[PDB]
A paper describes a structure:
G protein-coupled receptors (GPCRs) convert extracellular signals to intracellular responses, primarily by stimulating guanine nucleotide exchange on heterotrimeric G-protein Gα subunits. Upon receptor-stimulated exchange of GTP for GDP, Gα subunits undergo a conformational change, dominated by three mobile switch regions, resulting in separation of Gα from the obligate Gβγ heterodimer. Gα signaling is terminated by intrinsic hydrolysis of bound GTP to GDP, a reaction accelerated by ‘regulators of G-protein signaling’ (RGS proteins), and reversion of the Gα switch conformation to the inactive, GDP-bound state. Gα·GDP can then re-assemble a heterotrimer with Gβγ or, in the case of the Gαi/o subfamily, engage GoLoco motif proteins that are also selective for the inactive Gα state.
However, unlike the G42V mutant of Gα subunits, the G42R mutant retains normal GTP hydrolysis kinetics. Positioning of Gln-204 for hydrolysis may be possible if the Arg-42 side chain adopts an alternate rotamer. We also crystallized Gαi1(G42R)·GDP in complex with the GoLoco motif from RGS14 and derived an independent structural model at 2.8 Å resolution. In one of the two monomers of the asymmetric unit, Arg-42 adopts such an alternative rotamer that would allow Gln-204 to orient the nucleophilic water for hydrolysis. The structural model of Gαi1(G42R)·GDP bound to the GoLoco motif of RGS14 has provided a snapshot of an alternative Arg-42 rotamer that would indeed allow Gln-204 to access the orientation necessary for GTP hydrolysis. However, this rotamer still is expected to perturb the activated conformation of switch 3. We conclude that rotameric flexibility at Arg-42 allows the G42R mutant to retain GTPase activity while preventing appropriate active state switch conformations. Gα(G42R) mutants do not engage the active state-selective peptide KB-1753 nor RGS domains with high affinity, but instead favor interaction with Gβγ and GoLoco motifs in any nucleotide state. Our crystal structure models of Gαi1(G42R) indicates that this perturbed conformational flexibility is likely due to steric hindrance and electrostatic repulsion between the mutant Arg-42 side chain and residues of the switch regions.
Residue numbers in the entry:
A (entry chain A): 30 to 347
B (entry chain C): 496 to 510, 513 to 530
The structure:
Amino acid sequence: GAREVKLLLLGARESGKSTIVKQMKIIHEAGYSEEECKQYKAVVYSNTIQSIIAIIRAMGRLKIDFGDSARADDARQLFVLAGAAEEGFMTAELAGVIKRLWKDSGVQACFNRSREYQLNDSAAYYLNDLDRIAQPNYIPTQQDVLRTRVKTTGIVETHFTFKDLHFKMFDVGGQRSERKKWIHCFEGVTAIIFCVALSDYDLVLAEDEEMNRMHESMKLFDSICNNKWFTDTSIILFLNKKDLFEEKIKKSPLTICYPEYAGSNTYEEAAAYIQCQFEDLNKRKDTKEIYTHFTCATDTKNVQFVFDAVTDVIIKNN
Amino acid sequence: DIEGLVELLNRVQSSHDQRGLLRKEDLVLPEFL
Ligand SMILES: Nc1nc2c(ncn2[C@@H]2O[C@H](COP(=O)(O)OP(=O)(O)O)[C@@H](O)[C@H]2O)c(=O)[nH]1
């Protein structure tokens, strides 16, 4: 028994919340058994196809041509072969089509401009390992399951023990929940782990939003750690997708997100800046004390270390 | 208010066509084809 710690995950869609939870089951539990991994074989195939299709459609809306005029048919084949195949079924022809498309320079050119439209951050992952996924005897690795994207049916909760502590990690994902359910999450919460997708800094905003995921996150985070009702609740910042951010900061300047930024386009100086933008939203220099972390939710080794650090901080506060 | 907060939470964390299994809706050939 000893002590029980309640954790609550916040953060905009696609910020890595579900991933963190799935990490806990891998790190501080028995992970996924060979059998459990076989269950996701279907969704893995799906997400793969769903990704390539997402890019192909983008090529039409962005008016991008194929590097090879021959791929045109393959694009058509894709939807047909995908309209005709099923779950737990990966034809060598379909994989071949997806593969050739994933190689096309035009498709790549579109993939590079994935900031101008909505695309999942598991696309490149699967599309790269296509040859392995396509295999008949293929069984989703533990890292594969980690990358899967399924329909979040309501509120998820995971139990696990670590350093003589009983953790209960809650995550409300996508599911629009009533005022009632939310209260039961904020109640007794030892700490809130707020997740921010660093790579969202350069994304072109949607046609229905008034700002952008980054600023939306800032507006959310603001109300959170500034709400008097959370005074005793410890705030933990997870600046996530640091790896993708690093690759983006090379060609996409931080000025696109923060115009008043006069620093160099380096991962180190930009990330430090973003952190400050969030931490400066805390109108309590004395009271509140934000615990920031630059994480890669898909990197187990990382998450493990980060969470270990978080743990200590919680034990210390006694 | 807390309602405002809950409202914000709902719209910010609100989910698209790249989750779960395939659907006959995601398989519609784009117009330029
Ligand atoms: N490269 C990279 N990908 C990530 C990271 N965190 C999440 N992702 C990917 O982003 C996708 C969606 O993240 P998810 O956890 O479902 O977002 P959320 O549940 O709405 O908070 C997942 O399929 C992950 O593969 C990261 O730190 N680095």
